[PDB]
Design a protein around this ligand. Structure first.
Ligand SMILES: Cc1ccc(-n2nc(C(C)(C)C)cc2NC(=O)Nc2nc(CCOCc3ccccc3)cs2)cc1
Ligand SMILES: CCCCCCCCO[C@@H]1O[C@H](CO)[C@@H](O)[C@H](O)[C@H]1O
Length: 331
């Protein structure tokens, strides 16, 4: 049965939602509510200008199929998706519902310096999630603290939305091809922070960001020149005064012996030579939390279906069908 909805206004917007979701408050569009069927606190996302442009419809469609497909303890799945439209022609609004996490990794504690146990469990989770994400054939490209959802009990979720502080060098530079180890770079910069209480690469701009990265990991090795296809950059890479990669022990003073070993394997300048998210799970450092029998993989996800040239109406139909097809999780 199609449940019973209601009309409500909060700011400039007519939010129509099922009775199931109660005590609705706005939070920056997005409102937080109480689900009565489940007994959880939720955040509802009402989708902004759903079919304004081709680019909007395309974005809306993409967002859904992703999170609809997303089912992992450490990645943001969906609890529901609804629409107050009993047919396609009247369909013009999308609302998406997931469990509300209290804060992000910035303000759980990115202020002060945390304990090794605490960073083990934290990193273990992100890595547990990256594994899933990456097995879907998907690269986050924008991993950072303000993109990790944490509850009061350090139970971490990955979602999407100075920023460049956590980006991999090959993204700063903009090599148009890259692989999943760009996110590993993010984890290293995230981890390194959580261990020293200070930002690893406090870049003030693109170059400063780049120049601080080499200060640690050294200049490019002779084996990395062979991969640079751009003469533009290739000749510049030469002109530098070769840098020895710094000794991580003296960068992470008093830190866990194994956490130091991890940060070396992760913050490899050459991506090809960085650790896979799956490999990083098996690393000694996570012996505590690492359950090799509970680090699942996704199905492969079709990123080709989502990258097409179809009309406004043609996305609207494709997107609608998704909402009809959605079946909520268990609990
Ligand atoms: C164009 C596109 C690119 C990337 C993604 N994308 N990729 C991922 C993974 C890579 C799978 C992590 C996750 C997303 N999607 C999001 O992070 N969506 C979010 N939206 C908000 C706004 C309000 O928060 C409440 C709320 C309520 C209900 C649902 C979600 C959030 C915060 S997090 C989606 C679309
Ligand atoms: C000053 C120059 C900094 C070097 C940054 C490049 C290091 C990234 O490494 C490179 O990643 C690319 C895609 O991920 C691939 O083309 C290469 O195979 C890989 O070696």
């Amino acid at each position: 049965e199609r449940p019973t909805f209601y009309r409500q206004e909060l700011n400039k917007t007519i939010w129509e939602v099922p009775e199931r979701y109660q005590n609705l408050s706005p939070v920056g569009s997005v409102c937080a509510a109480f689900d009565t069927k489940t007994g959880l606190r939720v955040a509802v996302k009402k989708l902004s200008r759903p079919f304004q442009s081709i680019i909007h419809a395309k974005r809306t469609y993409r967002e859904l199929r992703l999170l609809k497909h997303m089912k992992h303890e450490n990645v943001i799945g969906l609890l529901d998706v609804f629409t107050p439209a009993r047919s396609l022609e009247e369909f013009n609004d999308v609302y998406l519902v997931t469990h509300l996490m209290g804060a992000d990794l910035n303000n759980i504690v990115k202020s002060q310096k945390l304990t090794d146990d605490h960073v083990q469990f934290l990193i273990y989770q992100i890595l547990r999630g990256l594994k899933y994400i990456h097995s879907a054939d998907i690269i986050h490209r924008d991993l950072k603290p303000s993109n990790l959802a944490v509850n009061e009990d350090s139970e971490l979720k990955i979602l999407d939305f100075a920023t460049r502080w956590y980006r991999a060098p090959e993204i700063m530079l903009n090599w148009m091809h890259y692989n999943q180890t760009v996110d590993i770079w993010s984890v290293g910069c995230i981890m390194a922070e959580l261990l020293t209480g200070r930002t690893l690469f406090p870049g003030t701009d693109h170059i400063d960001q780049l120049k601080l990265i080499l200060r640690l990991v050294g200049t490019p090795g002779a084996e990395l020149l062979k991969k640079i296809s751009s003469e533009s950059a290739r000749n510049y890479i030469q002109s530098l005064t070769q840098m020895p990669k710094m000794n991580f022990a003296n960068v992470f003073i008093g830190a866990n012996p194994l956490a130091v070993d991890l940060l070396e394997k992760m913050l490899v300048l050459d991506s090809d030579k960085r650790i896979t998210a799956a490999q990083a799970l098996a690393h000694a450092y996570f012996a505590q939390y690492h359950d090799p029998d509970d680090e699942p993989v996704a199905d492969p996800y079709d990123q080709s279906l989502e990258s097409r040239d179809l009309l406004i109406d043609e996305w609207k139909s494709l997107t609608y069908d998704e909402v009809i097809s959605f079946v909520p999780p268990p609990l």
